[PDB]
Amino acid sequence: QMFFGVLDREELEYFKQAESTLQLDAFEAPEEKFQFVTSIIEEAKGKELKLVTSQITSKLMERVILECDETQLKDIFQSFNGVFFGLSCHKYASHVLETLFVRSAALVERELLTYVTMENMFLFMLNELKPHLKTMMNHQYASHVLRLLILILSSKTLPVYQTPESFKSELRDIITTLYKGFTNGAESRSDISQSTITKFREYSVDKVASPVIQLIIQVEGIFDRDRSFWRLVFNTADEKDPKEESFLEYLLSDPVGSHFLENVIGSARLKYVERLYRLYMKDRIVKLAKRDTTGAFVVRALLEHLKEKDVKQILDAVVPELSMLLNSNMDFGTAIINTSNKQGGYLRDDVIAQLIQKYYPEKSDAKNILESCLLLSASTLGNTRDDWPTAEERRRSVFLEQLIDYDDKFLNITIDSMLALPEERLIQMCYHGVFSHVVEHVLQTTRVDIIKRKMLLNILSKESVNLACNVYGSHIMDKLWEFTAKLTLYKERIARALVLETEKVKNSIYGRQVWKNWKLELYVRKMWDWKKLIKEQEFEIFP
Numbered sequence: 151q152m153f154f155g156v157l158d159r160e161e162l163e164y165f166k167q168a169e170s171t172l173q174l175d176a177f178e179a180p181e182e183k184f185q186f187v188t189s190i191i192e193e194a195k196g197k198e199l200k201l202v203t204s205q206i207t208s209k210l211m212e213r214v215i216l217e218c219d220e221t222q223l224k225d226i227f228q229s230f231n232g233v234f235f236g237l238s239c240h241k242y243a244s245h246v247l248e249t250l251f252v253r254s255a256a257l258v259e260r261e262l263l264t265y266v267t268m269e270n271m272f273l274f275m276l277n278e279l280k281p282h283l284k285t286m287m288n289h290q291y292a293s294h295v296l297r298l299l300i301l302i303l304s305s306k307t308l309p310v311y312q313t314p315e316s317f318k319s320e321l322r323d324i325i326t327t328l329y330k331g332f333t334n335g336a337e338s339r340s341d342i343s344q345s346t347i348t349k350f351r352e353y354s355v356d357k358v359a360s361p362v363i364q365l366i367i368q369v370e371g372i373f374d375r376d377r378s379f380w381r382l383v384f385n386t387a388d389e390k391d392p393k394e395e396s397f398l399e400y401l402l403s404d405p406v407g408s409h410f411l412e413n414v415i416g417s418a419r420l421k422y423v424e425r426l427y428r429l430y431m432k433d434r435i436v437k438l439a440k441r442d443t444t445g446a447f448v449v450r451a452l453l454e455h456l457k458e459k460d461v462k463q464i465l466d467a468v469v470p471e472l473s474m475l476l477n478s479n480m481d482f483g484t485a486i487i488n489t490s491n492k493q494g495g496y497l498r499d500d501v502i503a504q505l506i507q508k509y510y511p512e513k514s515d516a517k518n519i520l521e522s523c524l525l526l527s528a529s530t531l532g533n534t535r536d537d538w539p540t541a542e543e544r545r546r547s548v549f550l551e552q553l554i555d556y557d558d559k560f561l562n563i564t565i566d567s568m569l570a571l572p573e574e575r576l577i578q579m580c581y582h583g584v585f586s587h588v589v590e591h592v593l594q595t596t597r598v599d600i601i602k603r604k605m606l607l608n609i610l611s612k613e614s615v616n617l618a619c620n621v622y623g624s625h626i627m628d629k630l631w632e633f634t635a636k637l638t639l640y641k642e643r644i645a646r647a648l649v650l651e652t653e654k655v656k657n658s659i660y661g662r663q664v665w666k667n668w669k670l671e672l673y674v675r676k677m678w679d680w681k682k683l684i685k686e687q688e689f690e691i692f693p
Contacts, residue, residue, distance in 0.1 A: 214226070
């Protein structure tokens with residue numbers, strides 16, 4: 151169902167102009183726009199298949215589908231009856247189907263909370279697709295449509311709607327149909343053979359099919375206690391199998407295979423994950439952890455989804471390697487530290503000793519954790535060009551914030567490192583899209599000694615108004631309302647500075663937030679009550 155004809159000279163002129171008018175959007179009322187869309191639909195009657203399959207017009211068709219009313223949506227839907235599979239396979243029409251299906255899914259939701267219905271129309275195309283599901287899964291365009299349909303039928307996030315119970319049944323029937331196709335009507339297992347299992351493992355790591363397999367393993371548990379597709383990829387018995395082992399060794403040394411395994415571990419039954427770990431990973435965890443681009447993603451997934459005893463076993467093995475892992479794989483290092491924290495600071499002394507040695511050796515005079523961990527001097531901080539903050543900068547910031555949350559030692563080291571900068575450089579951080587958040591992160595009132603608070607405040611308070619009016623700086627000013635607890639003079643100085651620039655501060659959307667959080671309406675209108683809030687805050691923060 152691939153070719154439906156070419157658009158002639160007149161149709162091309164008309165639909166180009168209509169598309170142009172539609173995007174200029176000069177209509178003065180929604181009613182005018184709807185009427186114009188209707189005029190487009192009227193001209194498209196009998197030509198819809200040509201229009202969705204032509205590169206020139208397929209995007210107009212998506213617009214129309216988005217802009218028309220419910221009744222028109224239904225008519226456009228039925229105009230595709232009998233060719234859904236061919237359209238799903240089409241380079242341009244498949245994207246039209248996706249737009250259609252997503253809007254249709256939203257319509258069955260309100261059709262549920264209140265002629266032939268959208269629900270029944272949707273079921274008709276599902277039944278038309280059922281004999282093609284296997285071909286779709288392997289089709290470079292139709293696999294995306296299949297994947298979207300499974301997302302819709304399982305009520306998951308589309309490019310999240312509630313669904314009829316008929317949808318839950320369709321999910322079951324679609325996945326079961328696919329299941330019978332990838333077996334041979336085996337009817338148990340067994341007799342599923344290798345190479346049928348091997349052929350399915352090949353799809354598992356196939357560029358086209360693999361995202362569909364992942365999603366299926368992810369949702370099949372909604373209606374299948376036995377996890378049939380999970381069992382198709384992996385075994386369930388209590389001992390190793392040679393073929394499963396070689397496949398596992400491939401996944402753990404292959405980028406797609408590792409990300410596949412990483413994703414399905416989060417949705418597998420716990421005992422199935424414990425089994426893969428026990429049989430194929432536990433005795434080689436350190437070796438796997440050192441594979442930055444492959445196996446390490448799997449080790450991280452184990453740390454996030456296994457139970458306490460196994461997680462601590464992995465930590466026993468990987469924590470001694472933490473400094474070395476941090477050399478090339480900071481994201482993994484962050485998750486290891488995070489997991490140690492979640493497991494009650496497990497191996498804390500070893501983690502801390504290593505991080506101190508690597509980022510803040512107490513024998514070094516040049517020591518500064520902003521420099522060793524954020525590479526501050528070589529960063530985009532203070533650049534005169536229009537350089538946004540980079541991905542590496544955000545990564546290093548997230549790592550440092552994790553350290554600050556791990557132990558007061560790193561909070562105190564970070565603050566000392568900020569106080570060690572030239573004052574201008576620390577202020578620059580306050581305006582930086584990523585490093586500002588690091589500044590905000592150290593403003594933890596009950597964890598920072600009052601002398602340290604005074605010293606930070608001596609610096610920040612000079613920039614009170616400009617920080618308050620800034621998109622990043624205003625979060626810092628918000629934190630300073632609590633950070634100045636037990637420091638009334640500092641709180642009074644900042645409040646006074648802001649009120650002196652009342653109009654400039656309230657002209658900023660960020661400033662108005664600070665104004666609210668600093669309760670400055672009270673400061674101005676009912677000073678006695680403001681002063682009372684300050685007294686109460688003190689005992690609320692420091693009881």
